[PDB]
Design a protein around this ligand. Structure first.
Ligand code: HEM
Ligand code: HEM
Ligand code: ARG
Ligand code: CAC
Ligand code: CAC
Ligand code: ZN
Lengths: 414, 416
C-alpha cells in the first residue's frame, strides 16, 4: 500500500505514508499513467448547477477543522468541539459556512505546502495572508491588489503573500481576476500570423482591448487588469507604473546583450487558480513569491511558443546555427539564464537559481518526511527545464497525490 | 469528447487521443489515489523469477494474444493458418506445458518489444533491428561466441547497427540462461581503501563478482570488464572480450585543448544484457540488445552523475569557473562542454552517435507515425526528455501517456 521511495544518488529509502490521507483522485489508473498531463479534469474545479450537498461539505469541513486545531495542538479542547458544533449548525441551516481569519491563514499556508508542482515549498510557513473577504466590488479588488503588489514587491526585497477574496456562493457568480498573473506582457496578433510580445498572452490582450483598453505595440507592454465582481462584466484597471518593478536584462561579460532590449517583471503572482479550504472554494485568491531563474531565462524567454530568443542570442554569440550537434541552443540558453541572475542581482531583486532552489527542496522533502511521513511532488515540474540531472531532485523518486487544502485549476470566466 | 486520454502538445497547440492504451493487458504502478510514475523500478515493471512453470491458462491467453498480433501484422487474421497455429500452440502447451515460436514470430515480437518500450527515445528505428536467433545455444562457451558475433556485427567499425541476440527461453524444471553483467561493455569500479571508487561506481558489485570468479583486476578508471555468462544449472563462467572487439573513443574538445589531457573516454556500443524479453508469455532471460548512444547518456549521465564518474567539478576547475557559488552556473557550463566533447570525439572517430536535439525531433516524428499506425505511443516522459536542456527540445512540451504493452522488455532480479 505504502510506496517505497528511493534516491538513486544517495541510495537512501523512505516510505510515503502521507499518500493515505489523499481523498481526491488523480488522472492515473492501473491501466495507464497520465502524470505528465498539465490540465486533467481531476485537478480542475468546474462550475455546477446546484450547491454541494451538506454531507460531503460537512465531512470536508470537519476534517479541515480537525487539521487546524491539531496544528495549534488544542486537538480535543472545548474550542475544538464548539468550532465543530458551529460549522455543523451553519451548514445544516445555510448549506454552507464561513472560516475564521486564523483558520484561513492556516489553510492558505497548508495549500501551498500541499502544492505538488511547487519547488519553493521550503518557504511555506512564511506567507502573509491578506483577508479580502470583505470586498464587494471590482474597484475594491483593485485597491486590495495594489496593496498586495506594493507589499510583496518591497522595493526589490520580495515577500511571499496571498490576498483572499470572497468565497463562491451557490446563489451567484464568482469574484474572478481574468488575468493568469497580476503582471503579464501584451501579445498582439500581427497581420501575418506573427505575434508581437508574449504569445501566451494573446487571448487576454484581446479581451482587454475588447473591454476598452488603448493598446501599445512594444514587446514588453504591461497589461491592465480585468477584475470581475459577481454576475458583473469585468472592469478594466491600469496598474500604476511605480507599482510594477521591472529588471532590464544585461549580461556580465557580453556587452551586446543589453542592446537586445530584454527585460522582465520582478513579481510572479498567479491569479487564476482556485484555493479550496475545508470545502470552501475561493475563486479569486492571488498568490506570489519570487522567481527561480529558469522560469524567466529558460521558459519565458526560450520556449518556442513564448519569446523564443534562442536563435537571436546564438547569432549574437556567433554560434554554429547550421547543425544541432554544435549545441548552440544549450550554450545560448546558459548565457540567457546567466544574464537573468546577474540582472536581478544587480538590481537588488530577489531571485533563486535552480541549483539553490532544488537543494532547498531536498531539505524540504526531508523535513516533511519527519513531519508528515511524506510529501506530494510532481517530478516533471520539480525538475528544472535545463540541466535536470545536474540537480538533486532529478535523482529523487517522488510520489504525487492530492491533499487538501489545495490550489486547483478552474475554468476561464469567459 | 472521446472516452480516451486527451493528449496535448503545448508548443503546437495540437490534440490527439490515445486509443492504443485500451489494448494494455498489464497493470502499472499508479492508482487514482497517487501517481508512482517517477519510480525507476516499481515492482510493477519487474518480472520476478519462477520456481514453477506459468499456469497453463494464463500462458495460453498470453500466447493466443501474441499469435493474434502476429497474424494481424501479416494481415491473415481469422484465416486457416491463423486458426491452425492457435490450435498448434494450445496442443504444445497441452502436452509440454509450454510452446515455441516460429522464426518469423520471434523476429516480429523482438521488434515489437522495442517498439513497445516507453523509456526509449530511439524508437523511430524500431523497424530496423537485426534479430540473431540463438535458441540453439547450449553452453556458456557458445554464449560467448554468439555475443562476440553480436558485438562485431553491431559495431561494424563505427557504423553501428541495432541488433539483439535471443538465447533459449525459460524452461520449467531447468535453470535460466543469464548474462550477469548489466551491459556487454562495462568499466570496472574498484572500492578503495578510503571508501571512494576508482572507475565506474555503478559497476562495483559486478566487478567484485568477476574478481570472486577468478578475474585478475586492473587499477584504471576505464578497465573493460569480462563477461560472466551462465548456462542452465551451471555456475557462471568468466570470458574476456578481445580488446580489438571493444571499440572505444578517446575524448577531446573541439576548442579546449586541455580536455584531451583528462584521459576520458567511452565505448561505442550500448548493449543492455540483463533485461528479460517477454513474448506471448514466453520469457527470454538472456537476450542482449544494442543500438547506438545518444550523446547525453555519456556526457551527462555517465560522466556527470554524482554517483557515476562525477567529473563536473574537475572540468569546471579546468575552465576556471567559480565553483564556490551556484549562481555562476558552473555546472551548466561544464556539462555543456562535456557533451560537446562527446559529440566531437564520436564524429571525429567516425562512430555513430546522436545529439539530444536530433534524437527528440526524430521521436516526435515517431509519435506522429505511431498515432496513425496504432493510435498512440506509450512514453515515459521523465525518460524521453534529456538530462540537460529539457525544454529546449520538442518532447518537453509534449504530453505523454504511459502504459505496458506486450511483447516487452522487463526488468529481472539479479541471478546471484
Ligand atoms: C517563495 C518563492 C517561490 C518560488 C521560488 C516558487 C517556484 C515555483 C516554480 C518554479 C513553479 C513552477 C512554475 C511553472 O513551471 O509554471 C511553481 C509553481 C507553483 N507554486 Fe511556487 N514558488 C514560490 C512561492 C509560491 C507561493 C507563495 C505559493 C502559494 C501561496 C506558490 C504556489 C505554487 C503553486 C500552486 C504552483 C503550481 C502552479 C501551476 O500549476 O501553474 N508558490 N512555484
Ligand atoms: C538505435 C538507437 C537507440 C537509441 C538512441 C536509444 C536511446 C535510448 C535512451 C537514451 C534510453 C535511456 C537510457 C537510460 O537513461 O538509462 C533508452 C532506453 C531503452 N531503449 Fe533505446 N535506444 C536505441 C536502441 C534500442 C534498441 C536496439 C532496443 C532494443 C531492441 C532499445 C530498447 C530500449 C529499452 C527497453 C530501454 C529502457 C531501458 C530501461 O528501462 O532501463 N533501444 N534507449
Ligand atoms: N511547466 C512545467 N514545468 N512543465 C513540466 C512538463 C509538463 C508537461 N508534460 C508539458 O508538456 O510541459
Ligand atoms: C546584439 As547582436 C544583434
Ligand atoms: C586539465 As585542467 C585544464
Ligand atoms: Zn501516474
Amino acid at each position: 500500500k505504502f510506496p517505497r521511495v528511493k534516491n538513486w544518488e544517495l541510495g537512501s529509502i523512505t516510505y510515503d505514508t502521507l499518500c493515505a490521507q489523499s481523498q481526491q483522485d488523480g488522472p492515473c489508473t492501473p491501466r495507464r499513467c497520465l502524470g505528465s498531463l498539465v490540465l486533467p479534469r481531476k485537478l480542475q474545479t468546474r462550475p455546477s448547477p446546484g450547491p454541494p450537498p451538506a454531507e460531503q461539505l460537512l465531512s470536508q469541513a470537519r476534517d479541515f477543522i480537525n487539521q487546524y486545531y491539531s496544528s495549534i495542538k488544542r486537538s480535543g479542547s472545548q474550542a475544538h468541539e464548539e468550532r465543530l458544533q458551529e460549522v455543523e449548525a451553519e451548514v445544516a441551516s445555510t448549506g454552507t459556512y464561513h472560516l475564521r481569519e486564523s483558520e484561513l491563514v492556516f489553510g492558505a499556508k497548508q495549500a501551498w505546502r500541499n502544492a505538488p508542482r511547487c519547488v519553493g515549498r521550503i518557504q511555506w510557513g512564511k506567507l502573509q495572508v491578506f483577508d479580502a473577504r470583505d470586498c464587494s466590488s471590482a474597484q475594491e479588488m483593485f485597491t486590495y491588489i495594489c496593496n498586495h503588489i506594493k507589499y510583496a514587491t518591497n522595493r526589490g526585497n520580495l515577500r511571499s503573500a496571498i490576498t483572499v477574496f470572497p468565497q463562491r456562493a451557490p446563489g451567484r457568480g464568482d469574484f474572478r481576476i481574468w488575468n493568469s498573473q497580476l503582471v503579464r506582457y501584451a501579445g498582439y496578433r500581427q497581420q501575418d500570423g506573427s505575434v508581437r510580445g508574449d504569445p501566451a498572452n494573446v487571448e487576454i490582450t484581446e479581451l482587454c482591448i475588447q473591454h476598452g483598453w488603448t493598446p501599445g505595440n512594444g514587446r514588453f507592454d504591461v497589461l491592465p487588469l480585468l477584475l470581475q465582481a459577481p454576475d458583473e462584466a469585468p472592469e478594466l484597471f491600469v496598474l500604476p507604473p511605480e507599482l510594477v518593478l521591472e529588471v532590464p536584462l544585461e549580461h556580465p561579460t557580453l556587452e551586446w546583450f543589453a542592446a537586445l532590449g530584454l527585460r522582465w517583471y520582478a513579481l510572479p503572482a498567479v491569479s487564476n487558480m482556485l484555493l479550496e479550504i475545508g470545502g470552501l472554494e475561493f475563486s479569486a485568491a492571488p498568490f506570489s513569491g519570487w522567481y527561480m531563474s529558469t522560469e524567466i531565462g529558460t521558459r519565458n524567454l526560450c520556449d518556442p511558443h513564448r519569446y523564443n530568443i534562442l536563435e537571436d542570442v546564438a547569432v549574437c554569440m556567433d554560434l554554429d546555427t547550421r547543425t544541432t550537434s554544435s549545441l548552440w541552443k544549450d550554450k545560448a540558453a546558459v548565457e540567457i539564464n546567466l544574464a537573468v541572475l546577474h540582472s536581478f542581482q544587480l538590481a537588488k531583486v530577489t531571485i533563486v537559481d535552480h541549483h539553490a532552489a532544488t537543494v532547498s527542496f531536498m531539505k524540504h522533502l526531508d523535513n516533511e518526511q519527519k513531519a508528515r511521513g511524506g510529501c506530494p511532488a510532481d517530478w516533471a515540474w520539480i525538475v528544472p527545464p535545463i540541466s535536470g540531472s545536474l540537480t538533486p531532485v532529478f535523482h529523487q523518486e517522488m510520489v504525487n497525490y492530492i491533499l487538501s487544502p489545495a490550489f486547483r485549476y478552474q475554468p476561464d470566466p469567459w
